[PDB]
């Protein structure tokens, strides 16, 4: 990642966490809930690691 704190290695194999994030945000749009926050996005985008 571009963040200086994050030294983790983000795996590119498997289903992309970005695809789940896009699907989850569309679900929240239907229910009129606010979109995923930055903290929630970072946790979801860092699920796949090496």
């Amino acid at each position: 990642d571009t963040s200086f704190i994050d030294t983790r290695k983000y795996c590119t194999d498997g289903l992309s966490p970005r695809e789940i994030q896009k699907a989850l945000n569309r679900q929240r749009a239907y229910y009129d809930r606010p979109e995923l926050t930055i903290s929630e996005n970072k946790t979801l985008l860092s699920q796949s690691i090496i």
């Binding site: 571009t2 963040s3 995923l36 930055i38 970072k42």
Partner: protein, 50 residues
């Protein structure tokens, strides 16, 4: 924080070249800082208004 500035001999409105903040889903960042510094005449009403 990296900053650059140009000092102009003429009078004018001191400002920044770019807007301060950029917001992304990943996080919030600060755009590059560049100053346009001018010398001041206190009795110039037009530049005081701006």
């Amino acid at each position: 924080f990296n900053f650059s500035y140009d000092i102009m001999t003429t009078d004018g409105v001191t400002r920044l070249k770019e807007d301060i903040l950029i917001v992304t889903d990943t996080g919030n960042d600060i755009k590059p800082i560049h100053f346009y510094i001018y010398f001041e005449n206190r009795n110039d009403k037009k530049l005081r208004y701006e």
